[PDB]
Amino acid sequence: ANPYARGPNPTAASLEASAGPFTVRSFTVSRPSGYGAGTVYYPTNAGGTVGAIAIVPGYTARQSSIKWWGPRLASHGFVVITIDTNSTLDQPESRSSQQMAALRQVASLNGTSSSPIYGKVDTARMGVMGWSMGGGGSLISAANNPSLKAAAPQAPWHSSTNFSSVTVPTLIFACENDSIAPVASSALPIYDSMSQNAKQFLEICGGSHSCANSGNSNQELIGKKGVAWMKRFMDNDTRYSTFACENPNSTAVCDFRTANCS
């Protein structure tokens, strides 16, 4: 049996729901180490240790922009840290360093007896997500740390679109009508550069640059795909293989690509 499988067998309905099967609590990180601020979301009743995911906002943005992922992922059996950066004007390399510092601190707290997440984390299984420059920072994190088990940036941007070095399973969310980081010059070239990995590209119809942020009108589809990708690749959970690899039946899909998915 897969030692990392958690929760009941998935269905479309269970993955499109606002909440997964586990109860979620959260806390503010008291002494952020290497980044500006953080909130940790965690399941109280997962029934084994779970992987950790670190999520970074874009330029000028704060945890509010990405917060919805915390409950959505934690409720399916993950510890999720959403961060504020040391400066709202930090660039991708700095955002990647701070994302990795946030994962380091989740590992520290997993060994801290006073922490709500004491003994809840499998510190060998980590993932990265983020918006825009925080998405570019996630891809830098993956390139630099190939032991990361999954990446799922949204509307990514970086100063270079060449992520051919990435060997981590990577799902790119893109927003059709993005005027900040146009799909044709940012997300799609980044996707096309990646030759060595399981990868997927999902572009949301009519979406502005914020189409995968807190308050979006496609949480059913976006949340299904993000949780399926992370379950498949962070937990090796092949119960999620079809949800992770499929072209989903949604009016909201305006571009779909996938390679090396199983």
Side-chain angles (χ1 to χ4, degrees):
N2 182 359
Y4 309 138
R6 304 281 172 267
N9 299 342
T11 64
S14 79
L15 297 181
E16 291 161 3
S18 293
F22 299 125
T23 297
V24 175
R25 289 181 69 170
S26 69
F27 64 88
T28 298
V29 174
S30 61
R31 202 161 191 210
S33 162
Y35 59 89
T39 309
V40 175
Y41 298 83
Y42 66 98
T44 65
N45 65 328
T49 59
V50 296
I53 300 168
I55 316 188
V56 184
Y59 199 78
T60 80
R62 294 182 170 74
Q63 290 178 64
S64 177
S65 61
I66 61 170
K67 165 173 61 196
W68 76 286
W69 280 121
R72 182 48 164 282
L73 284 155
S75 70
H76 284 273
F78 295 100
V79 172
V80 180
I81 184 164
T82 60
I83 71 169
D84 292 309
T85 53
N86 287 324
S87 168
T88 71
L89 307 181
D90 285 334
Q91 299 282 326
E93 287 283 350
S94 174
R95 289 179 190 277
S96 176
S97 298
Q98 287 180 69
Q99 181 169 53
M100 297 309 300
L103 286 175
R104 181 186 162 288
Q105 189 156 29
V106 169
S108 173
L109 294 172
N110 180 63
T112 299
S113 66
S114 62
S115 181
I117 61 165
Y118 186 56
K120 288 200 175 291
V121 188
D122 185 341
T123 64
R125 301 185 300 110
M126 290 177 163
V128 287
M129 295 175 68
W131 178 38
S132 200
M133 278 181 193
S138 300
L139 294 159
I140 296 167
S141 292
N144 289 331
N145 301 280
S147 289
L148 289 167
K149 285 199 54 53
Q154 65 200 52
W157 181 85
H158 188 38
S159 53
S160 171
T161 63
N162 182 3
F163 286 94
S164 67
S165 72
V166 171
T167 58
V168 174
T170 298
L171 167 54
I172 296 179
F173 294 108
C175 302
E176 185 176 37
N177 288 344
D178 196 324
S179 73
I180 300 306
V183 175
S185 54
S186 197
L188 182 57
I190 285 172
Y191 173 80
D192 282 338
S193 74
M194 290 185 296
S195 50
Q196 293 186 80
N197 59 345
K199 63 173 184 177
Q200 185 159 114
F201 184 80
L202 183 68
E203 185 194 83
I204 299 295
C205 290
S208 79
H209 185 57
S210 58
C211 84
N213 291 10
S214 305
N216 79 73
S217 66
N218 282 300
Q219 291 174 47
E220 292 75 17
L221 170 61
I222 294 171
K224 166 171 58 179
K225 272 287 185 181
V227 167
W229 195 261
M230 296 287 170
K231 281 276 210 188
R232 170 58 186 87
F233 294 109
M234 300 195 43
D235 301 351
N236 305 331
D237 191 343
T238 60
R239 294 182 294 170
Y240 291 83
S241 286
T242 294
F243 291 120
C245 298
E246 67 186 2
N247 183 353
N249 194 12
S250 175
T251 65
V253 176
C254 268
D255 199 348
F256 179 82
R257 307 175 191 221
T258 199
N260 302 326
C261 202
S262 62

